[PDB]
């Protein structure tokens, strides 16, 4: 509702194509094409994109609010781009990237080879740190979650893949 | 929470009555400052530790409006802090000027010396006035 009341601005070069309920945001980096719900009514005017409900639906604004943030991130991805840094804490935990595949050695008796989706590239400035980059915030967040499941840091030392913006709390090992 | 109507009428009514007798009222930006600095600025102006107070552009707008004053809205943009003088020569502009020790001036948006409006390029003129 309120969020939908805040029109989103699109930088220069950001080509926006609307086809009924489809939104194609192609800019400097990558191109995203998301399909809105059906109760949302996007209006391309001037150099911004407004959002509003549609007569005949209950939630109405409940959908316009999301579509406001959705296309919003779509523009941010095709302009500045999103990034997620996941560092590997622990002994023997290393990381390597050979092309579009990421090899991880989380103590496993066999190096894991995660496969990157559509447009998701990442390197490693350190043997224990990965930097994911993409144009889709939803995707870059899922890929970071996959590598986050391979080894969830325990509340004792935090050993395992974590997030650069995540705080892991630890605890003692009980007495006796 | 919030402040009841009757409780807000007084707040603005007070800041207005003190503005009618204030010989001066300089406005400036005080963001990123600490308490130790604020106190130091208060100790410099008056040993009573009371000087330089932060107020909203609204509380000041309707306060400067409740009193015959004009052309000051430009001095009320975003973070605003007022510094008036109800007694003694309003030449205490040198104190704050030297306190900010800034080679610029922008911070000290404007002021009103003796009912006379003054821009930001005049904050130094008064801060360099001889005894």
């Amino acid at each position: 509702s309120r969020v939908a009341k805040a029109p989103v601005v699109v930088p220069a070069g950001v080509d926006v194509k609307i086809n009924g309920q489809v939104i194609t945001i192609k800019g400097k980096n990558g191109e995203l094409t998301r399909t809105l719900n059906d109760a949302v009514e996007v209006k391309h005017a001037d150099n911004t994109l407004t959002f509003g409900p549609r007569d005949g639906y209950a939630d109405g604004w409940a959908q316009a609010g999301t579509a406001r943030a959705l296309l919003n991130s779509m523009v941010i991805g095709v302009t500045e781009g999103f990034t997620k840094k996941l560092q590997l804490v622990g002994v023997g935990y290393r990381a390597a990237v050979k092309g579009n595949v990421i090899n991880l050695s989380l103590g496993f008796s066999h190096p894991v080879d995660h496969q990157l989706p559509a447009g998701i590239t990442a390197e490693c400035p350190t043997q224990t740190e990965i930097v994911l980059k993409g144009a889709d915030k939803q995707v870059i967040g899922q890929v970071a979650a996959d590598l986050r499941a391979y080894r969830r840091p325990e509340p004792y030392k935090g050993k395992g893949v974590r997030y650069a913006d995540e705080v892991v709390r630890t605890k003692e090992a009980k007495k006796k | 929470m919030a402040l009841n109507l009757q409780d807000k009428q007084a707040i603005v009514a007070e800041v207005s009555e003190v503005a009618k007798g204030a010989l001066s009222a300089v406005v400036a930006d005080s963001r990123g400052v600490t308490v130790d600095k604020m106190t130091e600025l208060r100790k410099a102006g008056r040993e009573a530790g009371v000087y330089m107070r932060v107020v909203r552009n609204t509380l000041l707008r309707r306060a400067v409006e409740g009193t015959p004053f004009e052309c000051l809205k430009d001095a009320f943009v975003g973070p605003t802090l007022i510094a008036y003088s109800m007694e003694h020569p309003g030449a205490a502009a040198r104190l704050f000027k030297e306190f900010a020790k800034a080679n610029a001036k922008f911070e000290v948006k404007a002021a009103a010396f003796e009912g006379e409006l003054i821009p930001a390029s005049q904050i130094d003129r008064l801060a360099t006035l001889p005894t």
């Binding site: - | 600490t34 130790d36 600095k37 106190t39 040993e47 009573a48 530790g49 009371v50």
Partner: protein, 141 residues
């Protein structure tokens, strides 16, 4: 005047120069030495009088020693040799216990020249008279 940067405060009195049983290695485990608490500490402490629990900031950077500036001690340490008894309250409020007064703690909390807010010798003066009565003591002001 800036931000957080080490500044503990644990002492028992001004007499005990760098004690051990009370605290000891507790006053220096991050950047303070459990020995130099007599050089820079008693740098002027023995030049006045040792008998009032006086705390102090730490302030440590990375230059070995520290530049801690001692200041005015608690206003309670004046409630054992400046207000009256040193202890023994018997019963909390079931009895008025003891009792201070106006003249008492008057020129005792005035010596403070490195603390207190507001120079108004009437608002910052009575500010050191609340606790003196908060312990069940009566007010003879």
């Amino acid at each position: 005047a800036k931000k957080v940067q080490a500044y503990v405060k644990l002492q028992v009195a001004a007499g005990m120069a760098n004690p051990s049983p009370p605290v000891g290695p507790a006053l220096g485990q991050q950047g303070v030495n459990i020995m130099e608490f007599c050089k820079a500490f008693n740098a002027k402490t023995d030049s006045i009088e040792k008998g009032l629990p006086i705390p102090v900031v730490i302030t440590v950077y990375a230059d070995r020693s520290f530049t801690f500036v001692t200041k005015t001690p608690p206003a309670a340490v004046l409630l054992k040799k400046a207000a009256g008894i040193k202890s023994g309250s018997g019963k909390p409020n079931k009895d008025k216990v003891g009792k201070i007064s106006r003249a008492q703690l008057q020129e005792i909390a005035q010596t403070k020249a490195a603390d207190m807010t507001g120079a108004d010798i009437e608002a910052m003066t009575r500010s050191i008279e609340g606790t003196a009565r908060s312990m069940g003591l009566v007010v003879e002001d």
